[PDB]
Amino acid sequence: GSSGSSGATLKQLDGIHVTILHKEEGAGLGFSLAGGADLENKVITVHRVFPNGLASQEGTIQKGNEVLSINGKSLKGTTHHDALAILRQAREPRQAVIVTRKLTPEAMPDLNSSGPSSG
Numbered sequence: 011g012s013s014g015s016s017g018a019t020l021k022q023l024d025g026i027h028v029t030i031l032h033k034e035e036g037a038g039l040g041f042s043l044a045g046g047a048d049l050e051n052k053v054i055t056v057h058r059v060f061p062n063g064l065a066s067q068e069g070t071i072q073k074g075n076e077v078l079s080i081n082g083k084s085l086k087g088t089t090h091h092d093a094l095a096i097l098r099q100a101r102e103p104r105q106a107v108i109v110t111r112k113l114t115p116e117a118m119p120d121l122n123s124s125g126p127s128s129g
Contacts, residue, residue: 026078029070031106039106041065043077043097046090053077054085054093056110071108078109 031039040063045051056065056075065071079085081100088096100106 025112026109027070027112029065029068029108029110031064031068031108033064033101033104033106035102035104037064037101037104039063039065039071039097039101039108040067041071041073043080043090043093046093047087048089052087054088065108071110074115075110075113078111080106080108082107 033039041059042057043054044057045054054077056071056073056077059066059071059073071077077085080097081103083096083100085093100108
């Protein structure tokens with residue numbers, strides 16, 4: 011393994027964006043977990059993102075997204091329930107930490123094109 015080394019000519023290290031949700035104790039995140047170990051999707055994903063919630067509000071946790079961890083708890087192969095529950099526990103607090111990557115729905119578009127430069 012390894013971790014960093016020295017100041018490189020980069021900024022946006024990796025395509026991970028932490029989402030800090032600010033809610034009340036037992037207010038709910040606004041989204042649900044999907045997938046499991048016993049399922050076809052080992053990695054749990056965002057099942058759905060309620061229309062009236064925090065997750066949606068942020069816009070970070072979008073259905074289909076990849077849920078690496080929740081509340082700092084990484085999925086070591088948790089089932090569907092063990093996950094759902096764990097998710098129901100991450101909602102107990104007022105804040106929740108979910109690590110997800112920027113994924114696309116279908117046929118990822120080209121977020122770039124021959125253009126000008128800046129600096």
